[PDB]
Amino acid sequence: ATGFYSHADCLQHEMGQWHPECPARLQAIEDQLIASRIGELIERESAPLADEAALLRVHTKAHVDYLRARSPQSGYAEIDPDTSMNPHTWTAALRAAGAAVAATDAVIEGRYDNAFCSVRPPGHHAEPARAMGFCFFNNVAIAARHALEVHKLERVAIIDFDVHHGNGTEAAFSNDARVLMCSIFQHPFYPFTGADNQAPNMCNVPIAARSKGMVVREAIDMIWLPRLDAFKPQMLFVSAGFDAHREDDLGNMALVEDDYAWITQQIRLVADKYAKGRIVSCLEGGYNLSALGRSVVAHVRALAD
C-alpha cells in the first residue's frame, strides 16, 4: 500500500498571480489521479504540522526564527527575487515538512510500503540557513534526518531528479556519512552549484540542456546504481521534481512521463534489495499543469506498481 499525504492548507500559499509555483499545481495532481483512476490504489492521509525539533535537525535556530518573524499579517514579505511569504506560507511549509515526517513514521512502522507527499511549498533549495528558490524548509532532508535520529537508521539515500540541483540537501549533509545523495540536474543552471567540490557522499550528475531521457537513463544506470549497490541504503527519500519534463517552461530538459516511470522502477529495485521497500517521496518542482499531473501519476503508479 501507498500512502498519499496532502493538506488543503498547502493551497493557501501563493506568491502572486504571475508566479508559476502556484496552488493549481496541487489541483492538477488531484484531477489526474481522478482521470487516471489511480487515486483508488492509494490511501489518503492528512499532513500534520511539523514541530520545531523536526526543523532544527536540519536548519539553524536563526533560520526558523527568521521565517517565523517574517510571516506577514497581510500582503507579501519578500525572501528573494522570486520567493515571498503570504500570510499562509508558514502554515503551508509546516504541512509540507509535516507530511514528510509523518510519511516517514508510517513507512518505518509498516503502515505503508511507501508514500508520496503531494505538498507545497517545495523543499530541496532550502539550505540550513537559506530560504530561496520557492523553498523554505527542506522537507526531504527533514524526513531523512527524522529516520536517522528518531528511528535510529544507520544509512539512508536521497534521490533527487528535479531539474534544479538540490543545493539545500547538499548543504545539509556534506559531513554526514550516513547519507548518500544521488541526483541529476541541469548544468549550468539555477542554482549554479553542485558540479564542484563534491563531498564523497555526493553523487550529483550534471546534465546538458536539451538532453532527452536516454542520457538520464544511461547516467542513472552507469553512475547511480553502483553507488547505491555499494552503499545499501536502509531507506530511500525522493525529491520528486517533474520540471525536467519536455513541456516545462522552467527547465530545458526533455524527459517524459515514461522516464519518471522508469526512474521510479529503479528506485523500487534498490529499495526492495536493501531497504525493505521503504520509500518516502516529496513533491519538489514542476510547472506545466498537464505534464505535472501526468508525471506525478506515472510516479505514484510505479510506487503502487
Please, which residue, 86 or 169, has the CB nearer to Na ion? 169
User: With CB under 5 A as the contact rule, which of the stretches 169-177, 227-235, 253-261, 285-293 interacts with Zn ion?
Assistant: 285-293
d(CA 53, CA 55): 5
Determine which residue in the list 113, 127, 162, 243 makes contact with Na ion, applying CB under 5 A.
162
Please, which residue, 166 or 233, has the CB nearer to Zn ion? 166
d(CA 224, CA 214): 15
Confirm whether 19 is a catalytic residue.
Answer: no
Which is the catalytic residue, given 125, 146, 165, 299? 125
Please, which residue, 194 or 241, has the CB nearer to Zn ion? 241
- Spatial strand order in the sheet of 114-117: 43-46, 2-6, 114-117, 279-283, 236-240, 156-160, 179-186, 202-207
User: With CB under 5 A as the contact rule, which of the stretches 31-39, 137-145, 164-172, 245-253 interacts with Na ion?
Assistant: 164-172
Q: How far is the CB of 53 from Zn ion (least distance, A)?
A: 28
Q: How far is the CB of 238 from Na ion (least distance, A)?
A: 11
d(CA 185, CA 296): 18
Residue 241 sits in the site that holds Zn ion (CB under 5 A)? yes
Please, which residue, 207 or 235, has the CB nearer to Zn ion? 207
Residue 243 sits in the site that holds Zn ion (CB under 5 A)? yes
Q: How far is the CB of 21 from Na ion (least distance, A)?
A: 16
- Residue 146 contact partner, candidates Na ion, Zn ion, none, CB within 5 to 8 A by sort of partner: none
Q: Which residues contact 157 (CB under 8 A, 6 or more apart)?
A: 179, 180, 181, 182, 228, 231, 233, 235, 236, 237, 270
Q: What angle do CA 128, 131, 137 make, to 5 degrees?
A: 65
Q: Which residues contact 181 (CB under 8 A, 6 or more apart)?
A: 157, 158, 160, 166, 169, 170, 173, 201, 202, 203, 204
**Which residues would be at the binding site for Na ion (CB under 5 A)?**
160, 162, 165-166, 183, 185
**Interacting residues with Zn ion (CB under 5 A):** 162, 164, 241, 243, 285
Catalytic amino acids? 125
